[PDB]
């Protein structure tokens, strides 16, 4: 064989170019930096009103608006300062797996097992919430709607491919293929020109939203990646598996910077979020509780433990003022 | 201390709360049934026989059933099945014709063993009965399952297969298996589902009280 020999030596000698220039681990340098102690965060607000499991949640762009999508076919927009429900949207499918908020507060996208990413319009002339555009064209279940502008959004699916759509015409503007499993998550970059996606073949991959280019591939887990988010400066991204491992990969160093597992952990991570300073890498677990990990020393600097079922969604605001968590017991609890 | 507009906002929030509670109640009186089975197992036959994800809503004897079919899953990684907790029962369909039987057996073991489906009864169906014998005559369970040593007739072999699937149940203390054999042509496939969900619910109610 010739191309198999060339591909084998390509992967092994590019890994050798990575290893020969790999100076040291992230902890070997940050070891002398002092820890942050125990971040005992308290439940300030306890949003109630959902009567089924809560599957996803997105903050507003003004650190006050909020969306929560539940299993009983309800999408609720919360005022998170007075615990008031701003809006309640009936959902064509009770099989809601993900939801998103527009960065201008105008639209809200929500989708799931019916392969259709619905996009709703809140700022109407009639005072109700009508469905603006149902993006259809996926062959399987949907995950991680993520708004770029009011006319642009990337949606992951179980068709081993993600898709950049165009809300005006309604077509699949850009198609990102290259996975060998069901892409469970994606997270938009803070500059909104790149994104990363994690799939059920134990491997993430950094994609460019402009050219549809497979820029980088990430590996290191043994099981599927269930959720993903970016370091707030857009140069590193931490994922969370069912391996009970959160991992931090650098987009430029091409390998995992460091692992965020503990031996006492029995079950896998469901959600991953970053504080605004990039110093508290939160992680919701299936053990009914989330762990706020110190993102430089990998020590659990606090445990948010108020839910009665498995944590399903985390969200830190744009200023970092709060941590909304949502679980299968129908309760979002804000922690400050 | 509320401003003139916060008072109307709080009134709207309370009205939204009322609507959410009253629609939840309506959504909690509905029987959720997951539909599983291997390919060409009559999933398609049962959904038509029955009165992305495809939901079939039907009312039977005052019970409103939402039967959710997830066969259309492009790749069954099944990291989405946990979404089907709470479902009253998992209707699993198998066909004697399709050793596709050994495929159905491994699937049945998988569904019963789940940490998510340990309390949920399973309604297993062998609905069709018009082509389940004409093959037995020419070939019993010896060709697919070597271990069988019983009479190569319909009743004996069918009962043995049923028992061998039932044998897959690894904890009979919490869940039960309700098996069906009567021909699909008779319109009793739904009636059997109705009896089983009634039983599942009666037992769930008495088990909470502590009587069970």
């Amino acid at each position, epitope marked *: 064989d010739q191309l198999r020999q060339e591909a084998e030596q390509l992967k092994n000698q590019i890994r050798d170019a990575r290893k020969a220039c790999a100076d040291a681990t992230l902890s070997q340098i940050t070891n002398n930096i002092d820890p942050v102690g125990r971040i005992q965060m308290r439940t300030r607000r306890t949003l109630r009103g959902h009567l089924a499991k809560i599957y996803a949640m997105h903050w507003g762009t003004d650190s006050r608006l909020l969306v929560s999508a539940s299993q009983d076919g309800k999408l609720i927009i919360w005022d998170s300062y007075t615990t008031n429900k701003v809006h309640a949207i009936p959902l064509r499918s009770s099989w809601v797996m993900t939801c998103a908020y527009a960065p201008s507060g105008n639209y809200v996208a929500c989708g799931g097992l019916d392969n259709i990413c619905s996009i709703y319009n809140l700022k109407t002339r*009639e005072g109700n919430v009508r469905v603006s555009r149902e993006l259809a064209g996926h062959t399987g279940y949907l995950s991680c709607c993520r708004f770029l502008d009011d006319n642009q959004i990337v949606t992951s699916s179980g068709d081993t491919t993600c898709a950049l759509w165009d809300i005006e015409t309604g077509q699949q503007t850009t198609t990102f293929t290259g996975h060998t499993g069901d892409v469970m998550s994606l997270s938009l970059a803070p500059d909104t020109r790149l994104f990363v996606s994690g799939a059920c073949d134990a491997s993430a991959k950094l994609w460019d939203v402009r050219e549809g280019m497979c820029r980088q591939t990430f590996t290191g887990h043994e099981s599927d990646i269930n959720a993903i988010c970016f370091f707030p400066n857009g140069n590193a991204f931490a994922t969370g598996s069912d391996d009970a491992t959160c991992r931090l990969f650098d987009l430029r160093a091409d390998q995992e910077l460091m692992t965020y597992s503990h031996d006492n952990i029995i079950c896998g991570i469901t959600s991953v979020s970053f504080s605004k300073s990039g110093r508290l890498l939160l992680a919701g677990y299936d053990d009914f509780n989330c762990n706020v990990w110190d993102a430089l020393k990998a020590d659990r600097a606090g445990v948010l433990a108020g839910h009665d079922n498995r944590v399903s969604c985390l969200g830190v605001t744009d200023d970092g003022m709060a941590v909304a968590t949502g679980s299968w017991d129908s309760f979002l609890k804000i922690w400050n | *201390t509320l*401003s*003139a507009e*916060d*008072k*109307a*906002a709080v*009134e*709207r929030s309370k009205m939204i709360d009322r609507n959410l509670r009253e629609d939840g109640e309506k959504a909690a009186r509905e029987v959720k049934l997951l539909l599983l089975g291997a390919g060409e197992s009559g999933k398609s036959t049962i959904v038509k026989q029955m009165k992305g994800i495809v939901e079939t809503h039907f009312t039977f004897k005052d019970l409103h059933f939402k039967m959710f079919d997830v066969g259309g899953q492009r790749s069954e990684r099944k990291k989405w099945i946990h979404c089907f907790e709470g479902v009253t029962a998992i209707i699993f369909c198998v066909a004697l014709s399709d050793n596709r039987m050994h495929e159905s057996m491994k699937l049945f073991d998988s569904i019963c063993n789940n940490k998510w489906f340990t309390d949920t009864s399973i309604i297993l169906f062998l609905n069709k009965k018009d082509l389940f014998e004409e093959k037995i005559k020419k070939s019993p369970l010896t060709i697919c399952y070597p271990e069988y040593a019983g009479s190569n007739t319909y009743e004996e072999a069918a009962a043995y297969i049923q028992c061998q699937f039932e044998d897959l149940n690894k904890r009979k203390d919490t869940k039960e298996i309700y098996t069906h054999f009567t021909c699909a042509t008779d319109t009793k496939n739904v009636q059997f589902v109705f009896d089983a969900v009634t039983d599942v619910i009666i037992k769930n109610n008495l088990k909470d009280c502590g009587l069970f």
Partner: single-chain antibody
Amino acid sequence: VQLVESGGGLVQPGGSRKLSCSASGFAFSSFGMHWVRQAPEKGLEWVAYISSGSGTIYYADTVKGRFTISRDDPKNTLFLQMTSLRSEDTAMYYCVRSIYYYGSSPFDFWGQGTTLTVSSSDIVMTQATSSVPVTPGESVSISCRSSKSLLHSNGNTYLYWFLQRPGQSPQLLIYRMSNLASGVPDRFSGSGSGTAFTLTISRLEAEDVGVYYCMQHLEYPLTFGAGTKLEL
């Protein structure tokens, strides 16, 4: 959207008139409804208010207990039943919709108004003039003053700038001191602080002419300004 009223006409004093506000084109059961009035060539004056679901009902202290408010939500018909009418109740009555949530424009669409003619503490808002002559192409500044500071502890300054073109109904321009309305030309801008409030209109056109108005929402009873009229 089409709000349209009826029940206007001439009445002798001592009688009892009644007005209906038929709505066509929106969700009337999700909107609070104000009744506003305007005396002939004098200015606007708020009358009454009824929050969604008929819960909160407020009146102006001039006719508090002398009028009554009725509402039909599965029929979309809003009623004002006036019990005794003096020679001050004669006015053009308007029926305004108002939705209250975080970020709404709660004085957006005004009804066409109806004429009613009778034969013969509170915040004061003052407007500086009654007539300003100007030509098109000239940027104009209007100003009005309030008694209390309209800046609440929320940060919201509940001041509203309306415009009434001659022969028409009023139209919301600013709903929160410095917030434009739904589809008004971006030529207009509002600014000011606590008590002094100025509306700047750059690139004035021919249609911009009409009686402008400033109104506080901070306190019920809602009190309107005197009314600056742009002249051309």
